[PDB]
Ligand binder design. Structure first.
Ligand SMILES: *[C@@H]1O[C@H](CO)[C@@H](O[C@@H]2O[C@H](CO)[C@@H](O[C@@H]3O[C@H](CO)[C@@H](O)[C@H](O[C@H]4O[C@H](CO)[C@@H](O)[C@H](O)[C@@H]4O)[C@@H]3O)[C@H](O)[C@H]2NC(C)=O)[C@H](O)[C@H]1NC(C)=O
Ligand SMILES: *[C@@H]1O[C@H](CO)[C@@H](O[C@@H]2O[C@H](CO)[C@@H](O[C@@H]3O[C@H](CO)[C@@H](O)[C@H](O[C@H]4O[C@H](CO)[C@@H](O)[C@H](O)[C@@H]4O)[C@@H]3O)[C@H](O)[C@H]2NC(C)=O)[C@H](O)[C@H]1NC(C)=O
Ligand SMILES: *[C@@H]1O[C@H](CO)[C@@H](O[C@@H]2O[C@H](CO)[C@@H](O[C@@H]3O[C@H](CO)[C@@H](O)[C@H](O)[C@@H]3O)[C@H](O)[C@H]2NC(C)=O)[C@H](O)[C@H]1NC(C)=O
Ligand SMILES: *[C@@H]1O[C@H](CO)[C@@H](O[C@@H]2O[C@H](CO)[C@@H](O[C@@H]3O[C@H](CO)[C@@H](O)[C@H](O)[C@@H]3O)[C@H](O)[C@H]2NC(C)=O)[C@H](O)[C@H]1NC(C)=O
Ligand SMILES: *[C@@H]1O[C@H](CO)[C@@H](O[C@@H]2O[C@H](CO)[C@@H](O)[C@H](O)[C@H]2NC(C)=O)[C@H](O)[C@H]1NC(C)=O
Ligand SMILES: *[C@@H]1O[C@H](CO)[C@@H](O[C@@H]2O[C@H](CO)[C@@H](O)[C@H](O)[C@H]2NC(C)=O)[C@H](O)[C@H]1NC(C)=O
Ligand SMILES: *[C@@H]1O[C@H](CO)[C@@H](O[C@@H]2O[C@H](CO)[C@@H](O)[C@H](O)[C@H]2NC(C)=O)[C@H](O)[C@H]1NC(C)=O
Ligand SMILES: *[C@@H]1O[C@H](CO)[C@@H](O[C@@H]2O[C@H](CO)[C@@H](O)[C@H](O)[C@H]2NC(C)=O)[C@H](O)[C@H]1NC(C)=O
Ligand SMILES: O=C(O)CC[C@H](NC(=O)C(O)(CC(=O)O)CC(=O)O)C(=O)O
Ligand SMILES: O=C(O)CC[C@H](NC(=O)C(O)(CC(=O)O)CC(=O)O)C(=O)O
Ligand SMILES: *[C@@H]1O[C@H](CO)[C@@H](O)[C@H](O)[C@H]1NC(C)=O
Ligand SMILES: *[C@@H]1O[C@H](CO)[C@@H](O)[C@H](O)[C@H]1NC(C)=O
Ligand SMILES: *[C@@H]1O[C@H](CO)[C@@H](O)[C@H](O)[C@H]1NC(C)=O
Ligand SMILES: *[C@@H]1O[C@H](CO)[C@@H](O)[C@H](O)[C@H]1NC(C)=O
Ligand SMILES: *[C@@H]1O[C@H](CO)[C@@H](O)[C@H](O)[C@H]1NC(C)=O
Ligand SMILES: *[C@@H]1O[C@H](CO)[C@@H](O)[C@H](O)[C@H]1NC(C)=O
Ligand SMILES: [Ca+2]
Ligand SMILES: [Ca+2]
Ligand SMILES: [Cl-]
Ligand SMILES: [Cl-]
Ligand SMILES: [Zn+2]
Ligand SMILES: [Zn+2]
Ligand SMILES: [Zn+2]
Ligand SMILES: [Zn+2]
Lengths: 696, 696
């Protein structure tokens, strides 16, 4: 039989290992020749694997690169203007890679040029709340100051934005061992920890879903009209550079001024973590000087797009997509993902050569320039928006397959909760001590749901990865899955070697997944999801799961508002309409579920009607007017958090209207806008519900 | 057989006559009790006629009414502040209607209150070009002046906007006999001409498709959050009032200052038509004073929505919709339309009682408050936008069935050209001297196409009627048809009695269509279109007709640009991408047409795929970012003209970027924006084309 089991059994750990090794020997930075060559290889292999068509889709987008003959660096500079300390020009390359060319040195992509000079201020993680504490409680003024912040907690772009709005003239980012050095584990190459010379690369854009900064709304094709750099979306306005903790210790050790307000402002370096401004009396005459010469350049990028045509519904698209571009070798990010996608394509292709086709069309994507703002996925979605919104069933992301080896992590739309539970009950756990048990069992034991005993945690989709255009702009049901760490035992952030030169094949092979069993499990989850989405006769979405979470989110947003009872009285702020809409959604979803079970399974138009209602349900949560000042974030239920692009926020329109509302100067206007957002949310929920009513 | 012929034959002239009489005995102004009662009657009858469900959909929208105890009027006022002449408080009621209550006196709906006083300036039709001539060529300054303009040429809202931007403090609108008095025809009640006391009512909003001024984007439902009046969409900022030509003669006869620049500024009144400002020396001390006390009030409105469920594709909607609200009796506008809709419902209902159902679902609509800004249709579309955009096949409008008795007039999407040609070849001509000939023949002879011999004129859809939200916001294929006058023999504007108290049943019965044969023909065209749209196995859209017009429109826009050859050289302005997109659309449409003819007619999913490609083709011309500063006008090919809401403009984004470009202060920026609009248009055409490519 050609069934999901045949698909799953053909997937091999050893193939994934082989592909990972193949993908990680040289750097594959977006816009470079090496990443074009890898795109061509992938295209060629996907054809060999049996896909019906495989094309490159290219775009000319704004990228950012250091200047090869004028390196970026930071100095301590004395009263005489002598540079007494310089940060590193590159990370010490790992063993055996010391002769690899084109390792891009650490830099913050899209930094403007500058040589700003001034006094340091230490801003902890540069979060909204960290700045509120500096300005409001400690009375410290960042205007004209070079701010130094530790990576972590939130997306680095949010940090640079928060810094800019506080008036800083420069940002230095660093990795504190408190956040990137797991206790008792060796530094690379002898374990998986960040060494003192390791540095986290990364873009510092605030695109809010726009894609290429120069062409918001429209693909960056050959005839594209581009904004001028001055009108570009999302570029930082002050220079920024990342450093490791050895270099950071040299810049922090002399800090004077105010003490840290508490232990949550202190990392693990042997320094006071004084906020500043400036250095201590002996050194109060010294200052910090940045030297940033990176340039922004319109550069060609290449997505690989593979098609496996559906036998029955070729006009319905299930997309499996992940990025190919890396900062350096991409051992985890993204090649642990891409290797999995490669094997999934190979397995579907095997079935296809034996005469099988999925019911629906499967699209496979190798996205470019994700590291520079999700540009490849976004540009392609902008080009094909009409096709995607009328034909897009679901999107399954495929970035890094592992960030740990403890248990499964799933983030998805509530429409896929049931699919995920049912699939994981049929997969084997790869975990130690769960031999012969299901993935569902090991996952549920290690990551229990905070609400329901006997079920696992599934998180909301936020952003910061290539599902973003599909889910938050277009309203296509989306999900992602990977192996992760134990967040209880490990307070540290992401994984220590994230976006560093030390993210290699050897890192993975030696320290994360020697048997490639966690990779195989992830291939089975991602692959299995795609298989069911593309082959199940009735789409495997349970609208009733949406009803459940909508009530939870309405309860939560109401709780936030109810911190201001006097204002709710004064401005007649009622959540009644939102609760009524959620109630109606629950009732109508329940009736729809009955019809979907009891409908005449013989009739294909009836089947197609009800599959269309399921497909367009996620779509119904899109507001074509977007969110305030964020036209590309259109999902009324989910939007990336305005304080941390990484995290999901629910009813973001109402949440943002309530945020820090007690500080607004005109409370009548601010509570008016809360009421407006309540109306918009209620209406949207009711409108979504009504898509599931009988059609006529 | 239950076929289109059975449907057509059941339609009766005498029924339409009976319904017209029934609908026009009393006023049915939006928001009044009489129009609620008529909505209830229509609902009850549509149920009796056999529709599966008939509901009222209500909204609370901003309307506008004169103050019953403080009438609006205009004065000539002397140096002493004595009112020496007053305009009329009402139109002399027509014979036998002199005791009808609740005839709303003439007024300009949504005028603010005021009593401005000042010197008259005469602005001809208050068009863009008329103001360009006043300011640029004649050096006349309208700032602080009360402007008097004649109705005609363009939508009256555009006039008041043009006036406001010229700095006027008030607008007086009037009907000049040059534009509303056909030579040799008697005034009502002895013929169909406008008498001197007749007055054209009408709203003066500039909504740009927004609907209810207080709730743009979202239905004005029970829990709606409303803008404050200060932030409302589209309200005029200076007082405005309409008058008849007797009253206008009294205000114009004393005009001094500059002579009219030419005979195109002179109407037919026995006055000089001097531009002003002010009156002649004897009377230079007198001024004009307006007295406007109308109030804007949130008021409930009611649409009637009838459903005839499809037997095979109940989730596909063909909509027949027209308004019910009138300024007074609505003898032509809208009841000549609504009576036709009533009979069409009755005829579909007859078939339904004998066991027939259309293939697709038919929705019938009686819209409210069209006269106040298309509010009923727009609010309902806003509420149901998700359903309409995923399920909406087509919209057929049904306002006034007749504005003349000379020949047919059709305005529609190119997707319906073939449908209209084929239907009209099967209908009988009702025209004198064309007995036994087809409607196509009489129509083609009387209104020849300007491009193709042997075909009739079909015009573009613009706006100013209830198709607007469906076509220009949502991108649902739309059309309209009515009987019209001979535009060669009749230079006058619309029909003389438009929006006056004299628009009665008797007007129609005596002077337009005594046998109700033109009404019957219009019922057959509108009804026949609906029938084919709802019953044809393959949707009756020819994508190749779109290709043809897209080339014509690209040629036209290029011609406009080529008035500025030096600038096209200097700024490298190329139309190559747009022509390439149009070429590709033509080729891909041609291939699609072959597939649609040659496809396996046995397979229902293949049939549904290709019908979806046809349905979503109009949809593909929607830009979710809208047009600049007009978010509710989203159709890239068609948008109401920025100088005349009534007329269609093609490639409006590029047209508006080129308009008066030689006056822009920064040519580099202005030509940049032209290039941006070319990119957007090219991309959109190509994207639309690609919806017709093979799906995988
Ligand atoms: C969830 O679904 C339910 C349907 O089960 C839906 O109920 C609807 O709620 C509205 C209230 O928001 C009801 O509106 C009424 O409609 C009648 C005519 O049918 C009117 O007479 C009512 O207006 C009078 O009373 C008002 C309130 O005091 C006054 O403000 C007003 O001026 C009038 O005097 C009122 O408009 C509606 O009938 C029900 N529908 C049904 C079928 O019960 C509810 O709205 C849904 N929730 C959401 C968020 O959509
Ligand atoms: C209408 O349909 C046709 C397809 O039949 C479509 O043609 C495409 O046009 C573009 C040009 O806009 C071609 O783009 C090229 O793609 C190749 C790779 O496939 C590149 O090497 C080319 O780039 C080089 O040359 C450029 C031009 O001098 C340089 O600017 C560039 O830096 C490179 O050196 C170029 O990108 C494309 O191949 C064709 N596609 C096909 C299948 O022929 C046309 O674009 C469609 N019209 C619209 C408006 O979409
Ligand atoms: C995930 O797995 C669960 C458990 O199997 C699925 O739910 C089950 O779905 C089936 C098929 O629709 C339901 O069976 C039907 O039930 C009624 C009688 O109760 C009747 O129409 C038929 O006799 C038929 O057997 C079954 O009740 C239902 N079970 C539960 C506990 O809900 C679920 O659908 C799967 N999810 C996905 C996305 O596939
Ligand atoms: C309006 O009427 C015209 C004229 O009848 C319709 O065009 C005709 O459509 C038919 C049916 O698709 C075409 O017939 C087919 O043609 C090919 C061979 O040439 C073959 O597949 C079959 O043998 C079949 O007969 C016919 O050629 C075509 N005629 C013309 C002149 O185009 C048109 O489709 C109608 N429009 C609408 C919207 O219904
Ligand atoms: C990654 O694997 C690919 C595919 O096996 C290798 O590419 C092949 O390289 C050989 C030269 O050794 C050529 O004969 C083939 O034409 C290549 N095939 C394709 C599809 O590109 C590639 O060399 C491997 N890369 C590394 C670093 O091991
Ligand atoms: C930090 O790097 C700078 C730049 O290379 C060094 O400064 C240069 O040193 C030479 C002489 O040693 C001067 O002639 C250049 O003009 C200097 N350039 C600048 C911009 O100052 C500096 O020595 C380095 N400092 C340390 C401690 O390594
Ligand atoms: C328009 O026609 C309707 C329907 O025939 C008339 O309404 C009926 O009026 C009688 C009273 O004479 C009642 O018994 C019915 O209940 C009414 N029916 C409905 C459906 O409303 C209406 O009176 C006619 N109006 C005019 C002005 O002639
Ligand atoms: C135009 O109408 C106004 C308002 O009714 C008339 O003016 C009023 O006339 C009486 C005496 O005749 C005064 O006591 C009122 O105070 C006047 N009101 C105002 C606002 O002036 C006026 O007579 C009318 N003019 C004509 C020519 O009919
Ligand atoms: O530009 C963006 O929005 C994100 C690009 C890129 N994103 C990633 O690397 C991520 O894997 C995105 C993700 O997994 O959600 C970062 C993370 O989760 O810590 C970045 O954060 O630098
Ligand atoms: O508010 C609007 O946009 C138009 C409402 C209303 N429209 C009409 O009366 C029309 O019939 C609209 C139409 O037929 O396109 C006016 C006309 O064509 O002369 C009006 O013009 O006053
Ligand atoms: C690199 O830096 C030098 C010095 O400013 C400059 O002349 C050169 O053009 C730079 N290269 C780029 C690509 O900007
Ligand atoms: C912070 O410092 C600068 C002085 O250089 C001043 O201009 C700025 O307004 C200050 N901000 C506050 C909030 O005090
Ligand atoms: C891999 O698994 C075991 C967990 O007990 C451990 O040796 C190691 O810390 C894990 N690796 C990582 C990178 O978490
Ligand atoms: C009508 O006019 C009078 C005089 O200004 C005013 O007192 C009354 O309230 C008005 N009515 C309305 C509905 O505004
Ligand atoms: C027109 O007249 C007024 C004088 O009342 C003046 O303020 C305004 O600027 C003038 N406009 C032009 C264009 O001259
Ligand atoms: C109706 O038809 C004939 C056309 O010859 C004529 O008597 C009359 O002018 C027409 N009516 C109108 C209103 O155009
Ligand atoms: Ca873009
Ligand atoms: Ca509205
Ligand atoms: Cl992922
Ligand atoms: Cl019409
Ligand atoms: Zn990644
Ligand atoms: Zn990354
Ligand atoms: Zn009308
Ligand atoms: Zn009208």
């Amino acid at each position: 039989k050609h069934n999901m089991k045949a698909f799953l059994d053909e997937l091999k750990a050893e193939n994934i290992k082989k592909f990972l090794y193949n993908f990680t020997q040289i750097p594959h930075l977006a816009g470079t020749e090496q990443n074009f060559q890898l795109a061509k290889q992938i295209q060629s292999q996907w054809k060999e694997f049996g896909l019906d068509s495989v094309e490159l889709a290219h775009y000319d987008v704004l990228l950012s690169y250091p200047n090869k003959t004028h390196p970026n660096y930071i100095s301590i500079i004395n009263e005489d203007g002598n540079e007494i300390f310089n940060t590193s020009l590159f990370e010490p390359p790992p063993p055996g890679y010391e002769n690899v060319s084109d390792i891009v040195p650490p830099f913050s992509a899209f930094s403007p040029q500058g040589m700003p000079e001034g006094d340091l201020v230490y801003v902890n993680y540069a979060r909204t709340e960290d700045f509120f504490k500096l300005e409001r409680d400690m009375k410290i003024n960042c205007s004209g100051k070079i701010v130094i912040a530790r990576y972590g907690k939130v997306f680095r772009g949010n940090k640079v934005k928060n810094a800019q709005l506080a008036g800083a003239k420069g940002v230095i980012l660093y990795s504190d061992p408190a956040d990137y050095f797991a206790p008792g584990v060796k530094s690379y190459p002898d374990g998986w920890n960040l060494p003192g010379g390791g540095v986290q690369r990364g873009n510092i854009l605030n695109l809010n879903g726009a894609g290429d900064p120069l062409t918001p709304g429209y693909p960056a094709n050959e005839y594209a009209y581009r904004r001028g750099i001055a009108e570009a979306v999302g570029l930082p306005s002050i220079p920024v550079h990342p450093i490791g903790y050895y270099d950071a210790q040299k810049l922090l050790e002399k800090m004077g001024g105010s003490a840290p307000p508490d232990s949550s402002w202190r990392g693990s370096l042997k320094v006071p973590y004084n906020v500043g401004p400036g250095f201590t009396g002996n050194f109060s005459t010294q200052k910090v000087k940045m030297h940033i010469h990176s340039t922004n350049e319109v550069t060609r990028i290449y997505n690989v797009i593979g098609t496996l045509r559906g036998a029955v519904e070729p006009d319905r698209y299930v997309i499996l997509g992940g990025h190919r571009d890396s900062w350096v070798f991409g051992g985890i990010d993204p090649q642990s993902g891409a290797a999995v996608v490669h094997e999934i394509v190979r397995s579907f292709g095997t079935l296809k050569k034996e005469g099988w086709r999925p019911r629906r069309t499967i699209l496979f994507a190798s996205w470019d320039a994700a590291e520079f703002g999700l540009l490849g996925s976004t540009e392609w979605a902008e080009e094909n928006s009409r096709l995607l919104q009328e034909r897009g069933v679901a999107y399954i992301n495929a970035d890094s397959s592992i960030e740990g080896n403890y248990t499964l992590r799933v983030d998805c739309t509530p429409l896929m909760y049931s699919l995920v539970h049912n699939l994981t009950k049929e997969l084997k756990s790869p975990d130690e001590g769960f031999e012969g048990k299901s993935l569902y069992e090991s996952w549920t034991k290690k990551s229990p749901s905070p609400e329901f005993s006997g079920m696992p945690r599934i998180s909301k989709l936020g952003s910061g990865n290539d599902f973003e255009v599909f889910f938050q702009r277009l309203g296509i049901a989306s999900g992602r899955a990977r192996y992760t760490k134990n967040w209880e035992t490990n307070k540290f952030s992401g994984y220590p070697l994230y976006h560093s030169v030390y993210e290699t094949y050897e890192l993975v092979e030696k320290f994360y997944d020697p048997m490639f069993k966690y990779h195989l499990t992830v291939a089975q989850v991602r692959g299995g999801m795609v298989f069911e989405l593309a082959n199940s006769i009735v789409l495997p979405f349970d609208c009733r799961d949406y009803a459940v979470v909508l009530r939870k989110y309405a309860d939560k947003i109401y709780s936030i508002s109810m911190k201001h009872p006097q204002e709710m009285k004064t401005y007649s702020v009622s959540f009644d309409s939102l609760f009524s809409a959620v109630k109606n959604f629950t009732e109508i979803a329940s009736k729809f579920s009955e019809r979907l079970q009891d409908f005449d399974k013989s009739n294909p138009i009836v089947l197609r009607m009800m599959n269309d209602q399921l497909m367009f349900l996620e779509r119904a949560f899109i507001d074509p007017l977007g969110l305030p000042d964020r036209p590309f974030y259109r999902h009324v239920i989910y939007a990336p958090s305005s304080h941390n692009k990484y995290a999901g926020e629910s009813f973001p329109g109402i949440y943002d209207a309530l945020f820090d509302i007690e500080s607004k100067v005109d409370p009548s206007k601010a509570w008016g806008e809360v009421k407006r957002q309540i109306y918009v949310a209620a209406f949207t929920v009711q409108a979504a519900a009504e898509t599931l009513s009988e059609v006529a």
